Design a protein around this ligand. Structure first.
Ligand SMILES: [Mn+2]
Ligand SMILES: [Mn+2]
Length: 525
């Protein structure tokens, strides 16, 4: 680069797209609007003599059935048109077999990067660890990293010949590699690792803050992140804003001379970091999270409700609409097909499944016990994402109920462990996602202790072995549930929550909700 010359470089970023190629039911987000916003930034930046690099923190797969059905083809092809330069591989890129990920690399015209994922048998990397870009006179390297929690949360059959090195240790090595060989002017890490306030990762593997603190000072200009699914907007030192509001200031985190950003999820924002580079120094001039047609419900005096834009409207790019329309239309029509029926409403509304036992909890958990051979089961009420009305049930119905690709697991445990486990889970409170839905469990909890604890209507015997089904999310400590993934009787089946529910409905249809109706088997008073 030219000595003492000041170069303008803008870094744009998103993460945890999760199948949101199309705008939502309220006209929010989608890639067609993303494209208009991004093109606009590119025009603005080029007119001032600058450069743009656009990066993703991964988790493109899983979350919208029209996308999932098509293995995120629309999403990757849309990203080509928005003009992504690279992406970190997320954990949900392992929701499908590796061969599917390889064809996603095919569709993508930008590299899917991960330095820290190795084939055990050969000790060789499965993916490109980094990529190089020329922007004006500057050589910029982007390293990709993936949370080593991937191997704990996904299907273990996908990982028998794979290991994840701790990404922070990989990062030290790759940064040193680059510094000694290719000699880039700037290094940025695209990561799928998570932002945790003050590095307090808890049950999660260490993420971005802990990595930044462990690297040499200022060795990365920035970490473009993901996985935790936060807008990284700092209320105070080492504390993110809670309930960040669109269209308000966002101060990114900075740890050991390294900026850490994340743009929440689903294409809701494009982050924009405007830098000046001179003689190796990078200075951030502006940071913002730009809403992509985000909207808030409002109600006027006369009771009329509408959804109003937090910021001015972004038009949908029509080239994107022509590319993506066919995928949307094909997908939607396919997923409306009937897979069974129910003679009553299966209640999955938030104000119910986070407060009382519902028939939807019982249906989901019946499906999970049936697949695993379990005697009883539990999940977070917050993992039940919609209702299914009486009548015909479609593929789309099941997706809305179980959109996130959680894996079904089980644990054989003694009755003594069952007592300890349910006593803890029974302390989760209503008016929270953590509120437990049970199947085949009865008790009266009083004073934090379980009375007349029965499984399948029989008192618990401390010596007897019971099989419990639940999700990978709860089993590994999600919602503060007691960890099961270290018990010797634990098995992660790799079966996906929505598949299991779908197949159960298929083989049990027509459903009679009377079979799934809670009758006070569990109570607190
Ligand atoms: Mn995600
Ligand atoms: Mn993730």
């Amino acid at each position: 680069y030219e000595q003492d010359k000041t170069y303008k470089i803008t870094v744009l970023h998103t993460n945890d797209h999760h199948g949101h190629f199309w705008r939502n039911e309220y006209g929010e987000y989608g890639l067609a609007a993303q494209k208009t916003l991004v093109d606009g930034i590119r025009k603005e930046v080029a007119a001032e003599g600058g450069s743009v690099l656009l990066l993703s923190g991964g988790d493109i797969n899983t979350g919208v059935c029209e996308s999932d059905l098509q293995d995120a083809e629309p999403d990757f092809r849309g990203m080509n048109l928005v003009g992504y330069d690279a992406m970190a591989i997320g954990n949900h890129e392992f929701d499908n077999p590796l061969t599917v990920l390889r064809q996603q690399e095919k569709w993508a015209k930008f590299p899917l990067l991960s330095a820290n994922i190795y084939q055990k048998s050969t000790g060789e990397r499965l993916f490109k660890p980094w990529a190089l870009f020329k922007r004006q006179d500057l050589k910029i390297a982007v390293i990709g990293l993936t949370t080593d929690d991937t191997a704990k949360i996904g299907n273990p059959e996908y990982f028998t010949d794979i290991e994840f090195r701790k990404p922070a240790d990989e990062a030290k090595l790759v940064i040193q590699e680059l510094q000694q060989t290719e000699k880039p002017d700037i290094i940025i890490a695209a990561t799928h690792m998570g932002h945790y306030d003050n590095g307090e990762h808890g049950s999660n593997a260490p993420g971005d803050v802990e990595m930044a603190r462990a690297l040499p000072a200022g060795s990365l200009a920035m970490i473009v992140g993901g996985h935790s699914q936060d807008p990284v907007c700092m209320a105070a030192e080492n504390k993110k804003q809670v309930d960040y509001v669109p269209g308000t200031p966002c101060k990114p985190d900075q740890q050991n001379g390294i900026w850490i950003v994340q743009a929440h999820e689903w294409g809701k924002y494009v982050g924009r970091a405007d830098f000046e580079f001179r003689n190796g120094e990078m200075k951030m001039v502006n940071y913002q999270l730009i809403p992509v047609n985000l909207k808030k419900k409002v109600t006027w005096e006369d009771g009329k409700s509408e959804r109003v834009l937090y910021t001015p409207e972004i038009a949908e790019n029509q080239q994107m609409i022509s590319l993506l329309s066919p995928f949307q239309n094909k997908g939607k029509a396919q997923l409306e097909v009937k897979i069974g029926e129910t003679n009553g409403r299966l209640e999955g509304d938030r104000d119910k499944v986070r407060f009382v036992q519902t028939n939807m909890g019982r249906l989901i958990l019946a499906a999970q016990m049936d697949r695993t051979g379990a005697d009883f089961a539990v999940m977070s009420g917050g993992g039940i994402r919609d209702s299914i009305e009486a009548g015909d049930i479609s593929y789309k119905n099941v997706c809305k109920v179980q959109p996130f690709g959680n894996v079904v697991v089980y644990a054989d445990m003694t009755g003594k462990e069952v007592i300890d486990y349910l006593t803890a889970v029974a302390q989760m409170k209503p008016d929270s996602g953590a509120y437990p839905q049970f199947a085949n469990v009865s008790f009266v909890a009083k004073d934090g202790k379980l009375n007349d604890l029965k499984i399948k209507g029989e008192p618990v015997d401390p010596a007897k072995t019971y099989r419990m089904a639940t999700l990978n999310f709860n089993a590994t400590g999600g919602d503060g549930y007691p960890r099961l993934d270290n018990k010797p009787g634990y098995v992660n089946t790799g079966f996906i929550d929505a598949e299991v529910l779908k197949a159960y409905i298929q083989k049990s249809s027509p459903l009679d909700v009377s079979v799934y109706e809670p009758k006070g088997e569990v109570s607190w008073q």
